[PDB]
């Protein structure tokens, strides 16, 4: 974390044991790659220095094969950033090193010059966790989801909505799935009940309207 | 949360892990849509910035079908606010975006300019949670409640009072129900005991007076 | 709670999660109406603003029939206060509204003008909890208490002393009960042992002197 | 507790929930009258105002017969103090009321004028707890203690030392007991072993020297 | 820990019980020599004075044979440092004593003069823990690892990656192992599946590409 | 504990409940006389005033026979200090009373004049705990230790190293034991394996070298 001193200069402070434990328990209960960990990480990582975002991620509980993958993606995110942007002549303001906090004192990766590098690092870590999560799902998962025999639509909606979230497809194509796949994937019995209540709203009806049926 | 610095300027601070856990456990023990979560949220969310009210709600434990509904209602609350009020020419002081903290640094959604947007956001979240809760109950629930055979009136009162609370009907019509439905719903045996003790106070007697019987 | 800033102006702060949990656990372990909750509430509620005394009571764990009664009494306490005191012309310094923190920002129910209203509110809540507790006991409970066959006098004293506490009768009439009922309620076997050891101190002997017997 | 503000004026603060729980658990695990509670109370009660020493004692877990006795003794301690000292003309600097914090705002029982009353109150509470503890033991307990058949001397020493502590006899007469009763109470088998090893040190040997035997 | 006072002078503060417990639990759950303990130690030990790095390591939970080894290595690290660097004439700026905080007040091992000694001490402790860990593994562990019959490649990757980490061989030779040993160690059935999917990428394919197979 | 105020004057503060619990749990899990308690006590007792070192030791969990012994030794440590040093004429700067904090306000045993007395008190308490621990072990314990039949050398090393630690013999004579007793105490089977691998290093080999065998 970074503490902004009264004068205006900034100093480094270690992640507060409590916050470290909170992120740890969430990773242990769910997954380091899980969406939950990503959510809490982003909210509390604003203050975290680029080096901390990488040390307090490597202390979190997970498999060693998984950690290699999370570091595989953080590398491809870095190489992309190096490519997407031509270095400015003289090598520019920033480097993947500065961003990943390589060879920097913990009180210099928390100075004002590293605010931008600090944000880009967290951006990559969240993207890396999402990438490992996305691959963990074979494509077509919303298509694969089918309302289980005699299972509440709520349960089907929860599987289907997560499956649509699992896909990295843009929000608009995700929306289409919520409208189209829900009715189709819906088990025939709910689908017949939806057809009578929804009527023409076969795709028009929202998932909530579909939830009203069965 | 927002911290008001001595000078008067305001800065952003993350929800204190302890408070986050307290809201989380309450949601896990009851429901994110449950009244309990709504109560603690409102008391502790005053300081919370509009963005936090939306991030610290999405980290709370609940079903994914339920979260879609809570976001369904927050949308209809926003569209209503956009409709109820004509935008002032030049688009006015505020936008649903400013209110929902869209594209704002966490240290700018906590400045004095966003006090009003901060309150309107929480207003919508509490209303959204109530709406999901209300629909979860089919209308006529107080009418549906009937003192269970050989069950304490206290237990009946607890079901009936919550059922009256479940209805979004104004407080005065809710009061009428406490006076009228209680005696009628009351099982014949308590109802006969209430008739002799209450006498003319068949609807006049308060639920507490009815509690004295059986 | 209210924080007195150095300048002298006051600002509002939410009940510290820890203190909220401490009151909550006590209510869950005992009762919201229980004496224990009343004791801790009074000690820690001094700082609490009138609004908090009512929000941090409604979040505490209890039955919904019970909460109606606690709000029934807080109403009769308010109507009494409205009656006991004629409003001063112009409606006076205070109103039940100001006292119950109705339509007040949480940073204005904590200003110096609301110190008096803040205390009167807590006074009513403690009285309300006591009233629900008192009614929960049918009158004559000390008279009803009888030393159980072959039960330590200590156990009898604990039941009888609480029964005398349950009665809202003034402290002096409560004292008489400790002196008179104890010996009479005492089971014949202890009562015979008390008669020989106490001698003339049949009512003169304190409960502690009676405790020495059996 | 009392907080000494920078200027020098003092203000009242509630016992920190953590410290309250620590004293509570100790009382629940041992006893409110137990020595353990008395030890922690004295160390942490220095700051506590006279009123707090009486409110944070009445919230602690114990039987209601026991609490009457603890209040019985606090009364006889007060009447003694009222007797032991003639009131100075005009009624003097202090009163049992000021000492027991009767009719005083919690921010006035923590001002410098009440430092002396604050200490005298705690003095009485510790003495009161000791008195209830002492009576709980019939006199002659060290004499009653006898090394149990085939029980470690350590276990005997622990019972005997507590029994000597239970007696309110001055420290010097307590010491004599550690030297005399130990050997006599010691079971014949250890006593024979002590006689050969201790030799003339039958009373001369300390309990530690006796511990070396069996 | 070291606290930098406003003036600029530094003072000593004990490791915060919470942080001590966090390191302790991690050591108890894993090992004092375990990598996990090393990670958290390095992140939180920056502030720790050289003396604390040695006292808060000796209080951590572990076997006494293990602690001798951790102190064996810290000695050979010190003798190396004494050798690697000739002492400057007059014995130079620093000594293994100053580094290991020998005969220094806890408020002088935290002054600015001991920043360098403070870092060198932690450097040795982390190296010492790694050395005990490395020896605990017989050389050739990656070679020893063989994908267990009918075990997920993920599980094999986790064993193999840790085995490659166990070896103190430079990062580049470790990388070669991830590319070469993985396919060879891979059980014939996965190895055949890898051969068809990987094709020429027998060593070219990354562990993640190998993970895609079985 | 002692708090150094900005001006420079010092004030007393009670041991932070958390730190008290941490020392308590360690004593309960191990022993008040155990080495573990001694380690944490020394690190956290620097700030503690002489009176606290004696009150926060008497509240710790242990047998009453044990506490008498810990107070037996603290007395012989004091009498030694009184003897070892002639009192300076006028009775000198210090007294065992000042050191043991006898008849001193808790805000005067924490002033700068009592820094020296504060350290000497803790010195005695640690020595007292060690003395009780040492006697608890009959002399010759390292000689007594013999590698248990079919038990890892590690387990033998752990028993032997603690046994060498149990002895209060100077560090150099303790070292000789680690070199000599280890091989001799080692069970014949490990001893034969050590003889072949160690060769001439029968006493030359360190315990770690011996650990490599069996």
UniProtKB/Swiss-Prot annotation, chains A, B, C, D, E, F:
Domain of life per record: Viruses
Gene: gag
Subcellular locations according to the entry: Virion
Disulfide bonds listed in the record: none
Name of the featured protein: Capsid protein p25
Residues represented out of the complete protein: 137 to 350 of 441
